[PDB]
Symmetry: C3
Subunit: 341 residues, 3 copies
């Protein structure tokens, strides 16, 4: 019920779309997502103007989505291009809502609010995902929790030390150094674990290479819920700019008030042509983000009723600065909109 509608959200990964429509709900709005014959992606309200049937269950005819119930056909703009009934007239009332959609950086961005306020120049920058110098692998995940819980999770990558201990635990955690940068529509949480033994996973990034290492876990947040992290590890004490790293795509899109879509990926500049390294990253993604994080956040969502019924508020720790700031920016965006209508 409480969403920030005026903003770009990822609705799907390119590989998920085709001429066969995908039905997906974004911010409590059912959408029919498909790629037209010319390759351009279209996003229509998944509700036929005639009798509300799911257009996503239909097929393309002459490149146009055909409602499976009574045959009305629509173009990517939501305009009804064919009515096989009676005089076959096509009054404006037969047009269906179409959403602004942009395919960029191997992501399908959608604007669920006022289409007049849709500005592609405001789409977060995830260029590394299509940078030939980087190798990108990732996937999709559905989680039964409010998207904000996952934003919190990610804005404190420090949870890895426990929730993903088997892979990310470090014996230098106590020596953690952290800063928070607030910018124009952007917040960054910087983390540096100095001179520690590489973690199981960082050891894999360096290929079983132990030796005293330096690690960085930064994360950038952009308006609403799009984040890109910086996971780097380098021996002794080398520069952070000359180190091996992975820029992780971590984007959340609310489905319902208590559920969300999770788009994740890894864009690395090492072992670029190595199927095994691809396996490590995918294995990590499947185990950490899709299961371990899922377990915790889904359990937290189940306890929301109790915390709200009672007057329980969270007790912040020294690692929550970035998360609280992001959280407050989102709350402000919610309030602005609530004040628009």
């Amino acid at each position: 019920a409480t969403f920030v509608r005026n903003a770009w959200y990822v609705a799907a990964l390119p590989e998920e779309l085709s001429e066969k429509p995908l039905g997906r709900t974004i911010l409590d709005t059912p959408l029919a997502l498909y790629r037209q014959p010319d390759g351009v992606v279209a996003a229509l309200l998944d509700i036929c103007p005639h009798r509300f049937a799911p257009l996503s269950d239909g097929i393309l005819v002459n490149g146009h989505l055909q409602c499976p119930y009574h045959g009305l056909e629509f173009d990517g703009g939501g305009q009804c291009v064919h009515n096989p009934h009676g005089n076959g007239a096509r009054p404006a009332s037969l047009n269906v809502r179409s959403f602004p959609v942009v395919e960029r950086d191997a992501l399908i961005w959608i604007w669920p609010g006022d289409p007049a306020l849709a500005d592609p120049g405001a789409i977060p920058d995830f260029g590394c995902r299509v940078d030939p110098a980087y190798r990108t692998v990732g996937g999709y995940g559905h989680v039964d929790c409010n998207y904000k819980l996952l934003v919190d999770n990610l804005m404190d990558l420090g949870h890895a030390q426990y929730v993903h201990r088997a892979n990310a635990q470090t014996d230098a955690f106590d020596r953690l150094e952290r800063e928070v940068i607030v910018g124009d529509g952007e917040i960054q949480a910087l983390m540096k674990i100095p001179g520690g033994t590489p973690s199981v996973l960082m050891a894999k990034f360096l290929r079983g290479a132990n030796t005293p290492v330096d690690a960085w876990n930064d994360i950038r947040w952009n308006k609403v819920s799009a984040m890109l992290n910086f996971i780097a590890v380098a021996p002794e004490g080398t520069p952070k700019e000359q180190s091996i790293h992975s820029r992780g795509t971590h984007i959340l899109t609310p489905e319902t008030e208590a559920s969300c879509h999770y788009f994740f990926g890894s864009s690395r500049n090492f072992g670029i042509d190595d199927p095994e390294m691809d396996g490590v990253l995918r294995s990590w993604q499947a185990q950490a983000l899709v299961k371990e994080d899922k377990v915790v956040v889904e359990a937290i969502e189940r306890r929301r009723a109790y915390v709200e019924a009672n007057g329980i508020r969270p007790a912040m720790l020294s690692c929550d600065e970035a998360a609280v700031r992001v959280s407050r920016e989102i709350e402000k965006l919610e309030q602005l909109e609530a004040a628009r209508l």
Copy 2:
């Protein structure tokens, strides 16, 4: 929550009942339906007056339904005929509600509203179901949608062109001619598809007959949600009367506000003694009515919250006349009751 209680509804097909009670919910009312030893069907509120146990889980004793919890026995009138506890007294408070029920035309009709207003002369006529000149086959189906969505579906038989695309397909759909006839508690939609290629179904009807054909697809609606259609097809261009036909039973009974029972059947006057034609009708029903229709309407029900939250109203086409009229008669009946009671 919103039902027209003062009307006869089909609660079950005769073959569904026996001495073993059937538990079924009609208009949010749980019923225990069974056939007594003398063969007369009884309908009791499926809630024991003692501690609310489901009488439908009990068995008959001396022809009386015995509650499975503590043994109170009831007769078809809902009267408690035996109390095995203490002095075994049977105060009126132990009687359970019994509903007016009539077995006619191979259908079990029940009156869930004001019992004093129940009048068997008001039961729709489905005589063809027990006419020795007709061969009748059918069945039952449960659907997760408000019953009105299925009334719309049936009153707008045209959808078969796209929904049943593989069976009811017709190359004369654009040469369609409709005719609506209004009446008291009765509305009829007539449709004709002359001089065209028969669909696979009609083909199987005329035993794979060659040459063009003249079909007939009418449907009659009676107060609330009981319909009988007329599917006729004839060699080339012959009369509508002498034509081989099937009178289809299509009756809906709401279960909950978002779910309903669907009683269907075919009463044909051709291939009467042919197990195969039987298979042709049973297959169609299983395929078209239970599978294909189910999908479309259940998806529409899931989109109700969104259309209501927003102010979306349906955009009617030239094929919606009969459906809109029926829909308006039902709405009026709802209003009368809402007023009346």
Copy 3:
């Protein structure tokens, strides 16, 4: 939504707890139940004060439960004993609620209400469960019905077909039934292979504040004190989970065939000792009909066998009102 919070409820059987926390909901309150290294059971609100993660999914560190999300560690009192972040300060806001818990009679009792009113002297007496003269076997069961339906069932003395007698005390109610000789079938199956000749049967049940019951099933030759008879005291305790679901703790404490594995298996069966499948179908079915009975104005029609149940039911209702009246 409607619970009597100020009372002791069984949250688990001893054998269910260990250093690996058990997550369980009691009266709509999620709990993390575990046994510390010294063997003492602890019960914490299963909600970390930091960001609400389930402590029940964590593990013990130095004998302290560690939240699986960001590592805060707590002691059995709910006090935060370690914060691995920043200056590692531990302000009182990091403490988590801890519930009064007592392990007695091979049962884990918890007080979910006003912690100030909790008094261990008020815990029902189930001593037979740890009496060396008795052999006790039992188990756990979950049921999708309001706990009151099971209280009714039990107060209707194993109805699966001096004399009558119902005693009403304070926070306690007993229903006694002594049946000389027999008419349908007596002597009982287990009691069979012991004590013959004319006998006397016994089937009583004791109810204690809210939903804890202990029954008495016994038999002895002609005239004989129910004390020295061949008997079994059945533990039948219910603890609401949600308004429409509950936990069922059951057990048998017998003084016969004490060293005989044969009987344990049957005396440990959920269907044979707590509720036959056929009856479980009934209480869950009754729960599904609550909406209809409430929507309409349907009230139950009592029979001659409902006396004990109605009385217990009325004592519970009074307890509900007392608490409600507070707030």
